[PDB]
Amino acid sequence: DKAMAGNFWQSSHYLQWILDKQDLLKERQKDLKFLSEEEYWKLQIFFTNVIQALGEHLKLRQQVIATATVYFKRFYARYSLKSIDPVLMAPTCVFLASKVEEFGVVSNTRLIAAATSVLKTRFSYAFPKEFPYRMNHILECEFYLLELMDCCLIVYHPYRPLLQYVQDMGQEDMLLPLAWRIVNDTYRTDLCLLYPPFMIALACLHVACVVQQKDARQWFAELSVDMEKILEIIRVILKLYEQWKNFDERKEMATILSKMPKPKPPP
Amino acid sequence: MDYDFKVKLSSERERVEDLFEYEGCKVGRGTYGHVYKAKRKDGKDDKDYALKQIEGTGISMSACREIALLRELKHPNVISLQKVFLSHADRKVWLLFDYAEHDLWHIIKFHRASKVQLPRGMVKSLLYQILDGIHYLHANWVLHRDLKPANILVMGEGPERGRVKIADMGFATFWYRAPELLLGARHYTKAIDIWAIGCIFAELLTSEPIFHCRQNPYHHDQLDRIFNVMGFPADKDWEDIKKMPEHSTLMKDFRRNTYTNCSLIKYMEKHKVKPDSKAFHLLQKLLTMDPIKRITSEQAMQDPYFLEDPLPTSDVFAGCQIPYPKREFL
Numbered sequence: 358d359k360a361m362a363g364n365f366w367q368s369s370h371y372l373q374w375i376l377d378k379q380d381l382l383k384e385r386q387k388d389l390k391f392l393s394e395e396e397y398w399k400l401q402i403f404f405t406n407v408i409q410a411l412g413e414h415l416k417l418r419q420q421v422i423a424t425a426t427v428y429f430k431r432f433y434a435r436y437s438l439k440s441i442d443p444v445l446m447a448p449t450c451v452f453l454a455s456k457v458e459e460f461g462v463v464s465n466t467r468l469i470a471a472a473t474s475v476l477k478t479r480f481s482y483a484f485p486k487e488f489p490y491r492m493n494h495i496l497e498c499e500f501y502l503l504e505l506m507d508c509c510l511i512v513y514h515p516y517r518p519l520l521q522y523v524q525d526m527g528q529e530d531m532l533l534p535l536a537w538r539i540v541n542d543t544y545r546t547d548l549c550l551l552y553p554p555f556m557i558a559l560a561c562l563h564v565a566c567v568v569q570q571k572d573a574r575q576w577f578a579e580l581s582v583d584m585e586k587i588l589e590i591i592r593v594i595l596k597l598y599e600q601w602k603n604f605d606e607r608k609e610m611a612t613i614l615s616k617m618p619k620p621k622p623p624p
Numbered sequence: 625m626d627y628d629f630k631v632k633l634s635s636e637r638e639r640v641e642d643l644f645e646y647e648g649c650k651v652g653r654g655t656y657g658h659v660y661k662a663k664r665k666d667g668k669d670d671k672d673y674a675l676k677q678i679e680g681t682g683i684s685m686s687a688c689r690e691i692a693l694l695r696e697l698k699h700p701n702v703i704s705l706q707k708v709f710l711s712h713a714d715r716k717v718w719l720l721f722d723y724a725e726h727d728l729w730h731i732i733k734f735h736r737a738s739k740v741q742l743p744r745g746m747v748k749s750l751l752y753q754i755l756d757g758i759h760y761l762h763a764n765w766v767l768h769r770d771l772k773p774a775n776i777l778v779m780g781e782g783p784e785r786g787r788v789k790i791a792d793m794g795f796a797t798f799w800y801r802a803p804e805l806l807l808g809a810r811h812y813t814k815a816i817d818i819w820a821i822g823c824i825f826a827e828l829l830t831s832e833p834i835f836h837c838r839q840n841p842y843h844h845d846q847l848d849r850i851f852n853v854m855g856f857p858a859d860k861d862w863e864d865i866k867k868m869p870e871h872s873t874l875m876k877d878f879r880r881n882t883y884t885n886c887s888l889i890k891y892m893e894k895h896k897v898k899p900d901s902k903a904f905h906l907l908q909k910l911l912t913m914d915p916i917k918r919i920t921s922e923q924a925m926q927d928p929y930f931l932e933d934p935l936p937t938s939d940v941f942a943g944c945q946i947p948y949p950k951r952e953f954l
């Protein structure tokens with residue numbers, strides 16, 4: 358079994374990186390002068406998709422991609438989108454995450470080629486120019502990222518508790534594929550910054566049960582958990598699917614990216 | 625990258641050379657990098673710290689693993705990361721730790737040179753704190769992988785006087801290597817750490833490395849020495865020895881007959897440790913050849929050895945004068 362597996366309640370994740378929603382929303386006002394709330398949410402979905410695509414291209418397991426995604430979220434939870442180009446930060450997060458999760462140092466050539474090829478082939482609707490950054494830019498950005506995060510590298514995710522919950526139900530084949538994808542979908546929201554992962558797992562499992570019309574009311578009643586919190590998470594999940602429906606990333610993202618505030622250069 | 629953001633962070637960024645005095649205070653150099661005995665310049669603390677400049681530049685796998693892990697771990701018997709500095713100009717990574725004045729390598733060598741063996745209360749206390757620290761790492765699925773006297777630190781004068789701090793140089797002398805590794809086992813295990821702890825305990829009891837040996841996973845002479853001490857394992861003692869990749873090499877090179885008069889009992893008797901003692905019975909449970917027959921760290925902590933007079937103490941030196949020398953500057 359993996360390092361620090363049972364240590365969530367004593368972890369840096371829990372003790373420093375579960376944030377107050379109001380503190381998060383206060384720090385977001387900087388960027389809300391330039392972007393609407395809807396546009397800011399659309400941007401965070403877009404960059405979640407960029408990180409997923411980068412990870413897929415590099416052949417990284419979902420857990421490395423999830424950690425990279427949390428790192429990215431934590432950076433812009435504190436700082437403006439103008440502080441460091443998120444086109445640079447995204448591959449930096451994947452690069453750092455890959456070292457933390459013990460899949461290695463992605464080579465200079467392969468990281469840059471991956472950033473270049475993904476933007477060009479999967480995201481040309483957003484980006485007219487080729488990826489302009491080189492490895493020295495990634496290495497500088499990695500130092501800034503590690504500092505913001507207060508060197509908090511080990512991250513907990515809902516996949517493990519989810520797997521344990523469905524095994525207990527005896528419903529792994531029926532429910533796991535759907536619940537697993539719903540956990541992927543939660544990373545296009547702020548949920549990972551606001552709730553413990555096990556709580557996010559239970560919410561995704563509940564929505565999987567409702568979609569597939571499985572009665573799990575008895576099993577959920579028998580858990581020792583704050584069910585008002587679980588219902589808040591479910592509401593966020595249901596709202597994310599209505600946003601998904603109404604959002605055409607491909608039509609809108611070029612304009613939204615142009616409205617984004619951009620780095621001021623030296624005098 | 626935004627200019628205002630950059631200058632602001634640069635202005636507020638704590639630098640190691642501004643906060644700490646470590647010029648000419650180097651206390652170790654190795655493959656890990658460099659370690660200095662540091663004191664705060666802005667004199668609020670007035671307390672000694674170990675300051676490690678990590679070998680290389682940037683966020684190497686080594687720097688990343690040490691930071692990731694030590695950032696999370698919190699136990700009185702594990703060395704504690706206090707602060708991390710990223711030096712932007714040269715890309716050097718610095719780590720600030722507890723300063724432990726002593727360690728088991730110097731402590732054992734001091735006693736081995738004096739010819740005063742280790743006091744029995746001190747030995748028990750050392751072993752208990754080591755076990756307590758390893759039990760914490762093992763419960764978090766952190767294997768040490770290089771337990772030996774040099775990596776058992778002991779705090780000097782101050783508020784943690786005589787407390788063990790487990791550390792690591794990051795190696796990842798085969799004297800503390802379990803026989804399964806010597807016979808080509810592919811994976812590190814909790815059992816491998818327990819063997820090494822058994823080896824340290826014997827060394828604390830006698831002042832001599834139990835599997836001492838002159839300086840490819842297979843090493844013949846190290847196995848020879850282990851069998852000289854332990855005897856050659858019977859089929860019944862270690863049933864899966866046949867599944868080790870080097871098992872046939874072992875059979876080619878060694879004959880059971882060569883070690884018929886050899887046993888841990890006989891070895892320890894020669895070094896005036898009684899085989900009737902609770903100390904020996906614990907030692908024998910740690911130094912079991914078959915890894916699945918070694919006790920766990922928790923079970924070792926529960927042994928009646930630690931209920932016997934004298935009881936383990938938090939300060940391993942039990943309030944007595946520390947005779948051991950302080951670290952010399954290089």
Ligand SMILES: Cc1ccc(-n2nc(C(C)(C)C)cc2NC(=O)NCCN2CCN(C(=O)Nc3cc(C(C)(C)C)nn3-c3ccc(C)cc3)CC2)cc1
Nearest residue numbers: 651652659674686689690703729768774790791792793794
């Ligand atoms: C790549 C990597 C490296 C280390 C680690 N872990 N892992 C651990 C666990 C126990 C939690 C598993 C701990 C540490 N780090 C650590 O203890 N670092 C603290 C400082 N370092 C500095 C260098 N160092 C030594 O110099 N040890 C040592 C050996 C010796 C002799 C001469 C006896 C062979 N002296 N010293 C020594 C010198 C000076 C001081 C202050 C302390 C010890 C190891 C301790 C992880 C990843």
